[PDB]
Amino acid sequence: SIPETQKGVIFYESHGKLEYKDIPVPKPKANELLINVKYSGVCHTDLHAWHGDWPLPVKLPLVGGHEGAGVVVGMGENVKGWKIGDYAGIKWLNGSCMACEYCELGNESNCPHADLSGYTHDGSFQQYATADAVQAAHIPQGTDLAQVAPILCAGITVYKALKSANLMAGHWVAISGAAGGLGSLAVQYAKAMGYRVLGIDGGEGKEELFRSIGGEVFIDFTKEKDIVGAVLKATDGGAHGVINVSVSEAAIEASTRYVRANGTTVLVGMPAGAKCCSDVFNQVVKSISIVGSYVGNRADTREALDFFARGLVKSPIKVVGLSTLPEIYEKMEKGQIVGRYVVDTSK
Amino acid sequence: SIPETQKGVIFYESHGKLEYKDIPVPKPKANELLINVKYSGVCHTDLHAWHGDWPLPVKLPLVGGHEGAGVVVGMGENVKGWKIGDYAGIKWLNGSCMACEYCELGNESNCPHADLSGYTHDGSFQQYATADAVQAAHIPQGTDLAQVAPILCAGITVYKALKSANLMAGHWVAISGAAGGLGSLAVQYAKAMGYRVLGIDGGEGKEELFRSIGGEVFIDFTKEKDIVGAVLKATDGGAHGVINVSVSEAAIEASTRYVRANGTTVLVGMPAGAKCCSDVFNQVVKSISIVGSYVGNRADTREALDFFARGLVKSPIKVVGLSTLPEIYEKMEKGQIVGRYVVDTSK
Amino acid sequence: SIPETQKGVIFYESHGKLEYKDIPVPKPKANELLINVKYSGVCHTDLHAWHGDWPLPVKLPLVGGHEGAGVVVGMGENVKGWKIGDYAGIKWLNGSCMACEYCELGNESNCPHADLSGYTHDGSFQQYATADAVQAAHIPQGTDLAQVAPILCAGITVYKALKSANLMAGHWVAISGAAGGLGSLAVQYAKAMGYRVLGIDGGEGKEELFRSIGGEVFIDFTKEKDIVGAVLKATDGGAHGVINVSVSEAAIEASTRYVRANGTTVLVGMPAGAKCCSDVFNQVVKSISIVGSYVGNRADTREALDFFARGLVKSPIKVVGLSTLPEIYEKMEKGQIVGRYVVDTSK
Amino acid sequence: SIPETQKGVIFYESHGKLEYKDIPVPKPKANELLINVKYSGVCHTDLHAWHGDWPLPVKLPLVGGHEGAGVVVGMGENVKGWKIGDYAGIKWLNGSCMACEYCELGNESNCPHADLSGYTHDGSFQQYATADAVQAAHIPQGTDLAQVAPILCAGITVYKALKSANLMAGHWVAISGAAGGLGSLAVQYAKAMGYRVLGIDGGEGKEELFRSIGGEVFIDFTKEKDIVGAVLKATDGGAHGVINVSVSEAAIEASTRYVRANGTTVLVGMPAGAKCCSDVFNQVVKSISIVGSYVGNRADTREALDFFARGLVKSPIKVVGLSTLPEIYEKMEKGQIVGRYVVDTSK
Ligand SMILES: [Zn+2]
Ligand SMILES: [Zn+2]
Ligand SMILES: [Zn+2]
Ligand SMILES: [Zn+2]
Ligand SMILES: [Zn+2]
Ligand SMILES: [Zn+2]
């Protein structure tokens, strides 16, 4: 049943030729589950790990991927509440040390010794992948594993970002880039949380897509010359919360300007080198808070997946084979491929 | 009893010669109290009201001052819970429209129609001053009105700033400029709130004054070349909260680095023209929050004054007459003022 | 325009014959608005003000009523933020000091000197009624004043009760009596706040009504012998929050039993003489919290009325004349009334 | 060297003769540490496990004890974050599956398969004991293990109870039985958290011990006939929070009566069979919250032990050998035990 040989995309040298070759199957540890990855999502963090732009050293050779869904085919001799046949989801944090204030408090991502999938630990761009049982996401049975793969990163991130914004039901939330990949999920989650969504995006068929994902007010920045004034007129003042999915510095400056007094601006994107240069006087007088948000925790994962199971959050995805992931990586480096890409590891 | 003539410092033109001449005494309105200011504090905000640097227009001619304590000598025909002989304190916010969204949630400072003392309303650099009965602070009886004058602005500000850091008892709080005017009150309030104080100031007799105000760890920035390392070694892996009383850009830039993961940095000073240009990657990964803090509300006033009454907060002040304020303003513009200054309106 | 004679229901003696006679019109004070009540809601609290069951003494002769909507026809010489022609709503709290320790934190309903409508102050079972301008609710223009009258008490109460349960979006909330007058509004508000509603009521056409207002699971207590088991099975162990709109002791006991561990049970009804005798062991081991909720504050009023304006909360109610209120009171004392009753002060 | 034989107090039958005989030494599992218990605290929960009064079944034969401190002499092949020679503390909750609703949110005490020390798992009333490495408390090096043993249960309980009252620094906290074993630690922790302590205990030399622990006001219930009036006069009203360390019903009733409006009453004691029969009208009108608190989590343990290390919490204890525990149990059943008892496992 469990084979000795599998196949996956592995890069031996940083910024080398990503190769799809036969690799040895991993053996699970005492606290690890062996998961047969069925579908894996492709993210820009994968391109980052391939280049080596982030400060942490990358274990080489390594198979990338940090959003993979599959079936628990193997289990360690210490795993507690898992069974063979259960749906498991590999996330960015592939485990950490359960003995420090950070982890004990729930922020196990800020653990000094944290394992990351597709960076420090072999990821989900293969057929069989191992994962820490405690950090593995419990995907409900009867769910399409191709549609839940995109929510294993984007979904949890946007959900935790709204929780960090600290809004009440009936409050206005401005989402920059609301008709994009991370923006659409944000709009849906905010609508399911009881917030009034205001979307600022510009393009063809973007307004329609926003209104078809439960959109309230859409600001087209291509047809609007002043975005701050528009947001301040549509929300009887500023928006109580502003989720910044746009990495542009100009966008974040406008975000600090069109936020409501005593409001929160949440930063999600991480373009290494960017600076949120804003007027301190404005923030101090209007008592504005700028919060940075990273990956979500175990509880956040559970809650976001529950919304997906209820059927309030959806992601239109395009499924391709694992044998074509090299060319997908090249198009991702060229910045041309559009849409959430999910890779079938079977073919 | 209530005279018809009084004396105060009034400036007819912006940036003109401050004069000490006899002016008509104010008559109370329906919801206003007539207070006989006994002692008034001099702040750097008065120099700003004199120059016209801030954006709001100033009412001329006007008597400045926003921190004044005295006895209620007269009240209007609507004042509800005040009596003749009670001690009252005039603050920055001298009233607001109690009918809107902000004035109802407690943030009555963000009210569209707010009256500010020494800017839009006649202040307390006068013997008799009027104030809204709802925004006036209730100072307990038997208190020195000369020692409670400095706590009517600095005190409330630092207290709300330490309440905006979301800290728990036993947590580390770093205060930049801990041996200054605002920094000292901050240290005392944080010690009375159950926080471990770490002070970063440099000078002669500053370490001693910090250890004398219940200080726990002091970093001399004049004898230390790396402040971030020092803080991350003393406050274990960073300070849970950082109160920035220093207006220097370099200071706030270093503040965002010696903060613990998931911590908050509070901005109190407002040097119009300054910018907190920091790395976005760091804030998003460590999940740091930058919050701006302004003047406190009525509840905050009541709590801070209660600490002062218990006797856990003290301010060494120097008393001078009101006939000499015209020259104190010039020393304040030259930037030669060092300690807190309180003015006696009697002489 | 403002007449000298009006008509209203007044009772000279406690438990006397309610009469509909011509009474002098009230003259506004300095901080009070003169509202021409157009529609007024009848509550069970009016029967209590008529009997004298509650502990506070009633001002006689008095015109009852605490939920009335109308137009501002006159205002005092201190009112700030109101205009002639604006829609105003009289609530239970109709006066405060607004300068104490409970009036400065928002809990102005616990103020030592609080004025209550229909108890200590003349209420809204009158054509012209006066009210404090700071506590009066701002009803948006273009709204049916007959449908917003029931939401000026029931609505705010249920909303604050759902905000006191400390629930998150996607959490389970059990409402006892979900097909009643205070239960239906609760279901609607909880659905608009993002909570999953579970209703426990028994009768004919109640399950259907629950499915029309937006309820998820319905437990018929007449067809179910074990309600605790049913709730623990419909949810994944119990309901995160339980709103008790039923005044029965048995119901509140079963409520403490079918709550999730670390959950909150909110008490809204007040049958003087009732008791929640529950096992202390259970509450201490499962860390359950029993919170009591009273009338809402000004912020809560605004938020609840905003939901009503968006159109997510509705109340099926009729409109009987004020000349027939003397008989509605008798039907209310007999306990034979169905639905929410609204009285037209014009007829 | 780890021996093969040890000595401990084991009871084969429920309510049988506790014996001190040589028993086999436990072998650690994959995620468990082998601790050489040096000092162990005796609680009333041990007498409960001996009688079988609580509902859960006990694992016989069993060695009781839930508060034991010692050195890690052996660890499993999965333990991650511990070293040989580190000080470890065994608590009530040993270890549970970190995979459900209770573990992931921090409430790992409400887990379906939770292991309890001295009830379901062998406790610390022996020489060598095993414990889950994730639930074991990290005691700092250089600490007296005899003084930190009493703070491994009582301390954490009182700390979490004072954190469940939602109190601010400068607020009043009433502790019933402030001069007892669980009351003294409560007073000390509340003084270190910045709260004003009001103690209600009656006896000889109790007022002095309270004023020496850090208590502000003391109410002698033996010399006072009305306790509610006294607590309402000493706290300008009522206490913002009330920690009930007394198990009597009269005390808890008077507790709901002398709490401030919008305050919280925390229940810590668990006399199976008691009831807080209380008036519901009062709780609903004053918006009072009755919260139940159980054992603390990993984060709470860390924080409480940090206070003990700073030196702000102290417990006067009496050390006795383990060969005499068979008689201490009988004194505890007679209810004549005075002070906190700590047993030396060496003798
Ligand atoms: Zn990703
Ligand atoms: Zn760790
Ligand atoms: Zn100032
Ligand atoms: Zn306002
Ligand atoms: Zn009512
Ligand atoms: Zn114990």
UniProtKB/Swiss-Prot annotation, chains A, B, C, D:
Show the catalytic activity: a primary alcohol + NAD(+) = an aldehyde + NADH + H(+); a secondary alcohol + NAD(+) = a ketone + NADH + H(+); ethanol + NAD(+) = acetaldehyde + NADH + H(+); allyl alcohol + NADP(+) = acrolein + NADPH + H(+)
Keyword Oxidoreductase assigned to the entry: answer is yes
* Chain positions found as Phosphothreonine: 222
Positions of Zn(2+) 1 binding: 43, 66-67, 153
Indicate the impact reported for residue 44 to R.
Answer: Decreases dissociation constants by 4-fold for NAD(+) and 2-fold for NADH, while turnover numbers were decreased by 4-fold for ethanol oxidation and 6-fold for acetaldehyde reduction
What top-tier enzyme class does this entry carry? oxidoreductase
One GO term in the molecular function aspect is: identical protein binding
Give the subcellular location.
Cytoplasm
The UniProt induction remark is: Expressed in the presence of glucose.
- What is the top-level taxon of the source organism? Eukaryota
InterPro entries linked to this entry = ADH-like_C, ADH-like_N, ADH_Zn_CS, GroES-like_sf, NAD(P)-bd_dom_sf, PKS_ER
Q: Which Pfam families match?
A: ADH_N (PF08240), ADH_zinc_N (PF00107)
The entry's family comment says: Belongs to the zinc-containing alcohol dehydrogenase family.
Per the entry, what this protein does is: Preferentially fermentative isozyme that reduces acetaldehyde to ethanol during the fermentation of glucose. Major enzyme required for the conversion of acetaldehyde to ethanol. Plays a key role in the carbohydrate metabolism through the regeneration of NAD(+) from glycolytic NADH. In the reverse reaction, preferentially catalyzes the conversion of primary unbranched alcohols to their corresponding aldehydes. Also shows activity toward secondary alcohols. Most active with ethanol, and its activity decreases as the size of the alcohol is increased.
* Name the UniProt record assigns to this protein: Alcohol dehydrogenase 1
Organism source for this protein?
Saccharomyces cerevisiae (strain ATCC 204508 / S288c)
